[PDB]
Amino acid sequence: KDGTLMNEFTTPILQEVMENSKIMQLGKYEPMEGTEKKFTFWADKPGAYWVGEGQKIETSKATWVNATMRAFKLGVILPVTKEFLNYTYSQFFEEMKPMIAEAFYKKFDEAGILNQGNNPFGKSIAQSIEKTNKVIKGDFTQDNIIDLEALLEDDELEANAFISKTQNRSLLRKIVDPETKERIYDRNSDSLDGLPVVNLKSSNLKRGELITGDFDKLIYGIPQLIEYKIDETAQLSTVKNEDGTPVNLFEQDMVALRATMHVALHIADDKAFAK
Amino acid sequence: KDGTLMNEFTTPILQEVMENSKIMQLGKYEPMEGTEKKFTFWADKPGAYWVGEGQKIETSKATWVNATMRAFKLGVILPVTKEFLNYTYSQFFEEMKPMIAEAFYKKFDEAGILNQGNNPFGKSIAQSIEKTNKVIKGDFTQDNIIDLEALLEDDELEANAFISKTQNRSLLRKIVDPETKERIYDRNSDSLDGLPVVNLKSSNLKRGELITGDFDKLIYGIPQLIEYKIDETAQLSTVKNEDGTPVNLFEQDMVALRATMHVALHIADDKAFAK
Amino acid sequence: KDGTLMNEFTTPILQEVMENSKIMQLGKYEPMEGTEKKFTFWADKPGAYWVGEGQKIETSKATWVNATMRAFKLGVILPVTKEFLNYTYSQFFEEMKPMIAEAFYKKFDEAGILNQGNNPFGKSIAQSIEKTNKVIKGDFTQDNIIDLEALLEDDELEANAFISKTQNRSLLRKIVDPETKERIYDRNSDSLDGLPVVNLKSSNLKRGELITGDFDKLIYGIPQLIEYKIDETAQLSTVKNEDGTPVNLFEQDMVALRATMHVALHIADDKAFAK
Amino acid sequence: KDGTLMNEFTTPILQEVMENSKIMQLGKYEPMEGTEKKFTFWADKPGAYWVGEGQKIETSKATWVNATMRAFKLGVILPVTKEFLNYTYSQFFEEMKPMIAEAFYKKFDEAGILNQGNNPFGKSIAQSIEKTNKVIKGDFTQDNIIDLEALLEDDELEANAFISKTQNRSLLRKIVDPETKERIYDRNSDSLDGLPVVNLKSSNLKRGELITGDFDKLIYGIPQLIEYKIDETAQLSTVKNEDGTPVNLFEQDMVALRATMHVALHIADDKAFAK
Amino acid sequence: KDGTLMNEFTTPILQEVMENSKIMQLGKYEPMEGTEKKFTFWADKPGAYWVGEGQKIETSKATWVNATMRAFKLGVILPVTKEFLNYTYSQFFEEMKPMIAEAFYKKFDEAGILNQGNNPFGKSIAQSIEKTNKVIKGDFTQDNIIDLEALLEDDELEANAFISKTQNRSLLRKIVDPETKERIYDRNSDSLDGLPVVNLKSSNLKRGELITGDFDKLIYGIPQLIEYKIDETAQLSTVKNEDGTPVNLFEQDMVALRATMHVALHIADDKAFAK
Amino acid sequence: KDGTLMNEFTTPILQEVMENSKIMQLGKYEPMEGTEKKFTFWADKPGAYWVGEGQKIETSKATWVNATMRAFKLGVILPVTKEFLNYTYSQFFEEMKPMIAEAFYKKFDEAGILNQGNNPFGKSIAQSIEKTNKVIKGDFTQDNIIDLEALLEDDELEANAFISKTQNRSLLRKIVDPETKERIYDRNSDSLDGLPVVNLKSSNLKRGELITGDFDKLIYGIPQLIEYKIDETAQLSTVKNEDGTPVNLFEQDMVALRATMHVALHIADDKAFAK
Amino acid sequence: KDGTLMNEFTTPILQEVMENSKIMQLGKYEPMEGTEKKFTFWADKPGAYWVGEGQKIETSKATWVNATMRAFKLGVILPVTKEFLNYTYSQFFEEMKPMIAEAFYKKFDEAGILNQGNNPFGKSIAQSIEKTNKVIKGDFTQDNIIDLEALLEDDELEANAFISKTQNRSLLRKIVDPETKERIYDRNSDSLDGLPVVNLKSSNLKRGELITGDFDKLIYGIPQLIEYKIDETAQLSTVKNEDGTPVNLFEQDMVALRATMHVALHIADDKAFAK
């Protein structure tokens, strides 16, 4: 069990959607360190004569919580000896240094886009649904999607683009208005009211389109580094038993990433509710 | 509390609120205390040739009380001490003068278009609801929006621009007529039915566009500051707080912007009512 | 009486009603001395190898209408004495030449609809409704508006222009036809109706919309006149004995305009009535 | 009694009546005193290796009628004295020859296109409605208008041109269709039907479309010279007493016209039903 | 009595009906009256370590059919005596060959389009509708016309051209269509559902949408004059012979046409039915 | 009964349409039986200054099917004696190789896209559509057609064209989009949204189109092999009766062309709702 | 002659009428439609070194009343014929306009000072009767005249000149008493209390002297309308008595002016009372 030589390559199933995950979130400006904060609150009070009204404005909301990339894998442990012996599995791990790094890049944006993904904690849509009642309950319609865009507009803002899941994109494109097109019906993605939609692969989102405005994407950069020591799930091949093993044999490259997502005031959400 | 070495940042909202205050209201400039407005009506003569019938009416309108801009409080006082010590906070104090100037029009629009803190006797919606009930009850529709414009135009007038809210912006986009697909909100130009309409973004207005013809903007400018003594004083952790608290040293920045608005006694409104 | 300063004079409202009055109801500015005449001829015969019988017609038309003039009188009584002392009241009567012109144009255009002073041959709409039925009680419809235009087109000649009030203009824009291409509304063009529509603000019409074939308008009259009262509506100033008679006046400015309205053969009529 | 100086007829209805009276309604006009039209019916019979029998016969129909425009009575009698004295009335009588020429077309169309105007040697829609019916009377609708074209195809198998009536255009425009085309005419389109035809003035027919395809209106019509003796109607009063009609001195212009209409059993007529 | 007289017969609208039969069929001319075959094709599907099993064989259909063109009877009896004395009636019988050819095409088309026309064995419209429900029963609709083509597509056959009638053209135009464009009878291309449709004169049944795929055109030729012996349709006393023998009279003018048509079960003709 | 030689060949306008069915689906050809496998996402870490997660996906995919062109005997029994004696039926069996190839393309597509056979079985497009439940309930409408194309583009890559069944193509031709453009129809090439829709002759597919772009199509080659010794009996008789097929010359040739198809869950299809 | 005049002469004692014009002066001259507001005293107190406490006040004047000068009665009618015929009397009427200008100033000053026949509310004697009486009169005395100025000084007001009638001037200057004080007379003008004062020609009582402090002068000019209309209001006797109707003949000129005197808080006035 676990240890066979065979040619394997991953293509356009998850890696294609991974590269555009944070770009769909619209990461306006990438900061060096997690210290980006908004200060303006805007204060004024109108009187008439012989009166002095006071005004105060001071705010700071910085986002800094690094999320690591994938370490040495249990499946790659059986393939590590195949990497040393054959050229096929070595090129597979070298392609993984970009493919699985993109998967770590995908899950980092998914932490903000979905509440179930916990890494950044208190960022984008994950913080939006809990703090503000922006999510519309029920079936996503052409009028309901514009009503979802109203929730993003309610906090003195405007929605840029709506992030769509693999199953949520079908339900959004199915709905069409009484007279207006709404569902595009040509080649382009179906718009909620006017703004274009971008696809983002998610595990939590199934029905309804969530829209994000201004939430920054800033990172140290998801890389790859070859190492000998990594503690995870135990793996054994022949004449060996592993219980507290980490440093003994090299399985896969311990990739390093330090990513952060800037928190927004209000971002739109949509979900199907049944009782 | 400390309050030292901080970077002040402004979000893209103050620039939009300041420009739309008088532009949506169509406030004509007048260099006088209060306001003066005129209205005239002439009479016609009979069919038979002998003598011509005279008597012609002349009516005048005036507005009172110009709302003054609010001075800086304890929040800006903590930053002004940092402005004297640090180079970065010194430019922030001058930027605070410009931000409050934008907020001065924001309070003027709240007093002008809405009845949130009425400084003038005719406050668009307050002038409508008290004198002539032209407001349409119920949900906003494309047929109902033109009918709302019909309510203002019936009393010898014409609808120029409908003041849009944050929730009303996307509510107009959702609205569509039985035959006509026109709504105008997602596009660069937004109109109620045909004639151009600008968004006001007010705390008092909840849902529904409110049309208005002519108004006034007088003697308005920007904040004048040098050295000011506070009267009431907001509660703060930094520096001493007292009942008769004022500062001789640089802490508070004074403001000077007085403006008054006149009503034509014919303006439309829209609001949702529960069945 | 009070008195008070005139300050300023309005022009904005009267300017729109003055220009559109003569062009309304398909107006023709054709020069006529005293009265204009129109004639029509008809013949009918069929037969062979026998005596022939023929017929001939000669029609006569008359249009005799007098000038519309208005003095300063009881209406501008507080401004008549104020003309000698204040600069605003003196310039008011000179500017009233264009304001009373709007009133002189107001009665001439209203005579086509109905009006109190019927200078013309009855009324261009009332005599047309008595000759041919076109008006329907209830509510004006978009399909019915095309039928109303066809109602004038059926008798004698095809209709070109449809006259409408300010309240009717907003009501016609609210109305939409069964086909998308058929309905024009407020969104497309200045005119709501399909055919050429002219705005005429009058108390006699008040939401009706009636069409006309072809009617002529001939106007000639200078606005320069000054005399010591003739009509006398109400007493002025109150300081001397005896009040009522038109004898002895301090200041009065009269403006005359002699205009004759020529009757059309066939026109349309439409009015709304509550059930 | 007493008529001088003033002359010239405007002729608003006579100008358009001459164009589409017989020219639009009928296909071709081939000049003859008694024109004859022919039609052949082909025979066909199929069988298995036997003799083929089938009688084919050609049926011909002749049309001969002379409808001349007569010299005018009563009206021209007062005008003849004015023609001899004044140059204006003499030129008016020569222009009346061209006006009566249009009236001769009006009398020809009344008994040629319309049902029973002068009843000039039968034919017209009157012959079609009595012998073969083909009218299908009812309410004027979009389905009923197509049924009029279908009635011509059911009896003779020939497509018919649009109606030449202005009073029927009012009933035609009021009709609404499920399709976007609607078919209304007058507002933008020349004709509601498939083919294009101009509306003509009707004296006998009140309401309903007069659609006819293949027809013949052969004519030899021209204005004739005025003679000394004529008797038709009322005699004119002057210095010498006269009661019996003979003219003697006064002259009225006649016309020599021979117009005939040919039938083809393909004409549409609509009539309103009320019980 | 039937008196012989010199008269030229008109070609009328019947001359265009000749080309309709072959154009609606859209089939190649076969060298002789025989048989046309079509393959059934297709074999059993995929399988490893298994038997192949049998496949379908080609099936031939009957293409040869008996037909006859009728000769002129007692209808051309008065014309035969006029042919001997005058050159006009003699040239009329030679020109009647083209008229008889139109009748010869009319009999062939009547079998393919209708059940009332009896000539060909196994009617194209009648037998196909009886064997399988392809023809629409009830009200004529634009959506129902596509449904008739869909019934033909169920048997793996695409409709090339729709068989149009003069009565059916007005019925198809009156039917409401979901599309904003709308074809309506004929404009330039004339389409029933999508592809181009040809008009055909049909006295039998009529007033219903018909569609056709591929029907055979066959060799026959035109008229062959002999002027001897006849079956005799009308008996008469002096104009025609009582006994069917014709003796030596040249009223016969024999015609030769033995054509045929064979088509697959795809063509269907809709018919109106009363509830 | 009766196995007589006819010496007649039947082909074209049936075999040509079936050949373009399976190849138009667009898939990469593979040398041996076995599909290309792709790994599905590697797991990621969430925390900083910790061990990190380690998991990688293993790729798995397979496609194995051996297709064959069937040897005919059920219909080739009479044709076997005709092939051995006459050159026409012998050349017909060689031309039947192109007919069997059409069946080989038909069986490859019908098992996948329509699930008529179980050749693909596991990797069948219709079976995958049932497993995914992406099918739209109801009639094939313009709104449903755009939703069907979007259903594939949401889950995976956007499909090129929706696979038609000719009968479904005609029903979809009746439906047209909201914008001024007809969907598919019969202009030049039928298209669902982008690329040209491939019509496939199917027994299972009748109404509703399935959209698949990334579906594999691979074959061993073309079907051509020798004929020797009888197998699988359906019908065999001429002079002596037989129960089981053995001995003598073969009726039609069994031909080898092993084809297999792999799927990636893209097809959706549409089913009509019945109550 | 009664009405007829040959030689016209200028009016005697012209300097006395001009002296009354200059007498109506105490508190400047300002031209307006009504009365202009004059600000209060506003005093300030020294108090101490550090604390700065004072007072500021503003007073307002009510805007009312304007001047008028009317046409002369009876005597003007005699002068009307003389002015029209002779150039010398016409120049005398223009010189009479300057004499009536002196009378216009005389009327406004006299009615304000005595009898209260002015339109102006609160002036000299009318101001004393409404607010507070300063001096009581019975017998003319030197001590009583000094007490009148002391009564005005008690309400904080300094008098510059005491205007009085010609009958009261001699009584105030010279009085039989024990000791005489303050008279002047020989220097420039006779004094009542101890200041130089001008006497005005007015219809006033001989017993009782009046004193003025501050009263505003206002004017709009003199002699505006020269040509007179119909005379009816004035009582005429010369040449022809006018009561009802009168032709266009100028008798006397109409003069236009506007006067309003500012109401003083303290003004001295004395009125005679019986014992």
Author numbering:
A (entry chain C), B (entry chain B), C (entry chain G), D (entry chain F), E (entry chain E), F (entry chain D), ...: 35 to 309
What's in the article?
80α is a typical example of a staphylococcal transducing phage, capable of transferring non-specific chromosomal or plasmid DNA at low frequency. The capsids are assembled from a major capsid protein (CP) as empty precursor procapsids into which the DNA is packaged through the portal by the phage terminase. Many SaPIs, such as SaPI1, redirect the 80α capsid assembly pathway to form capsids that are smaller than the normal phage capsids and that are thus incapable of packaging full-length phage genomes. Here, we report the structures of a mature 80α capsid made from an uncleavable version of CP at 5.2 Å resolution and of a wildtype SaPI1 mature capsid at 8.4 Å resolution.
Reasoning that empty particles would be more amenable to 3D reconstruction, since the lack of internal DNA would reduce the background noise, we chose a sample in which the majority of the capsids had ejected their DNA upon prolonged exposure at 22 °C. The reconstruction reached a final resolution of 5.2 Å by the FSC0.143 criterion. Compared to the procapsid, the mature capsid is larger and more angular and has a thinner shell. No density could be assigned for the N-terminal 30 residues of CP, including the N-terminal 14 residues that are normally cleaved from WT capsids. There are considerable differences between the CP subunit in the mature capsid compared to the procapsid, especially in the N-arm, E-loop, P-loop and part of the spine helix (α3). In the mature capsid (which has no SP), the β-strand folds underneath the E-loop that extends from the adjacent subunits, while α1 is rotated by 81° towards the outside of the capsid relative to its orientation in the procapsid. This is accompanied by a straightening of the spine helix (α3) and major changes in the preceding α2 helix and the P-loop (green in Figure 6D), presenting a concerted rotation of the subunit that leads to a disruption of the α-helical palisade seen in the procapsid. During maturation, the CP subunits are rotated from a perpendicular orientation in which the A domains protrude on the surface of the capsid, to a lateral orientation in which both A- and P-domains lie tangentially in the plane of the shell. This rotation is accompanied by a reorganization of the asymmetric, skewed hexamers to almost perfectly six-fold symmetric hexamers. We hypothesize that this rotation is triggered by the release of the N-arm from SP, thereby coupling the capsid expansion to scaffolding removal.
